[PDB]
Design a protein around this ligand. Structure first.
Ligand SMILES: CN1CCC(Oc2ccc3ncn(-c4cc(OCc5ccccc5C(F)(F)F)c(C(N)=O)s4)c3c2)CC1
Ligand SMILES: [Cl-]
Ligand SMILES: [Cl-]
Length: 251
């Protein structure tokens, strides 16, 4: 828990909340990442909210949730580093964008992996009481899938009930994510939120591509039911004949 315990290899990403960098723990050479945050302009109130969230971040331990490792305060530069698991396969948004640009659909086997492992990640969250967007879902080097923590944008995954302001709402969002993985587009698209909301209320969308099994289409379609109580629970999802041991995480 000193910055000197790690060596930065290079920057992975930049943007709103400082930099994300790939680092190496000196003690044992383990490859990790950290988020570099400048809290210099923060009030005591804001810094307080920051402390509480980092504390909860330490609470979640699960193979399908991105693991938190450490927090380092550098009062000299008013920077806080949050050290997390490195996921070499990157995020799901990059995977979809890649597929969209290259014109190549993802394997059914890969979609089943994401369905199985994200459903389990969700199952864990629901127990505790965290958006299920592709940019927040990561892949490691071993076919494992991990859920990360985290106005202009279009709310593609907004559920019907949320639209008119529920664990079943999470199932809808999972539905949209799995749909987009298969179709390389969200089930409901629009140019404005008003248009989007109209489509969501009608609850109609294209079947996922024919390369995908009727069984997989069926379960995704069920998650996209207008009525929250017709959507399958995490338990009912995991009971599906499609889902097998090899779709689960492996060390
Ligand atoms: C090409 N482009 C694809 C995505 C990549 O970002 C990575 C790569 C490896 C990672 N190992 C753990 N993380 C986590 C990053 C994060 O928030 C930041 C983030 C989210 C989504 C896309 C990019 C980033 C970026 F800032 F790193 F760029 C996590 C969370 N909040 O739990 S976990 C990786 C992110 C590489 C660049
Ligand atoms: Cl295509
Ligand atoms: Cl396939």
């Amino acid at each position: 828990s000193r910055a000197e315990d790690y060596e930065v290899l290079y920057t992975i990403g930049t943007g709103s909340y400082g930099r994300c960098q790939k680092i190496r723990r000196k003690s044992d050479g383990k490859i990790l990442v950290w988020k570099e945050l400048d809290y210099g302009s923060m009030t005591e109130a804001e810094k307080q909210m920051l402390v509480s969230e980092v504390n909860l971040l330490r609470e979640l331990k699960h193979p399908n949730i991105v693991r938190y490792y450490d927090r380092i305060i550098d009062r000299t530069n008013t920077t806080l580093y949050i050290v997390m698991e490195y996921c070499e396969g990157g995020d799901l948004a990059s995977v979809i964008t890649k597929g969209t640009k290259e014109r190549q659909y993802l394997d059914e086997e890969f979609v089943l992996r994401v369905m199985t492992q994200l459903t389990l990640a969700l199952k864990e969250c629901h127990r505790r009481s965290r958006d299920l967007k592709p940019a927040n879902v990561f892949l490691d080097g071993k076919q494992n899938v991990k859920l990360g923590d985290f106005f202009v944008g279009t709310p593609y995954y907004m559920s019907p009930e949320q639209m008119n302001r529920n664990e079943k709402s999470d199932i809808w969002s999972l539905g949209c994510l799995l749909y987009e993985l298969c179709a390389l587009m969200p089930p409901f698209t629009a140019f404005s939120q008003k248009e989007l909301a109209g489509k969501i209320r009608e609850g109609k969308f294209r079947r996922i591509p024919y390369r995908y099994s009727d069984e997989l289409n069926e379960i995704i379609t069920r998650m996209l039911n207008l009525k929250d109580y017709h959507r399958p629970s995490v338990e009912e999802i995991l009971e599906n004949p499609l889902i097998l041991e090899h779709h689960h995480h492996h060390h």
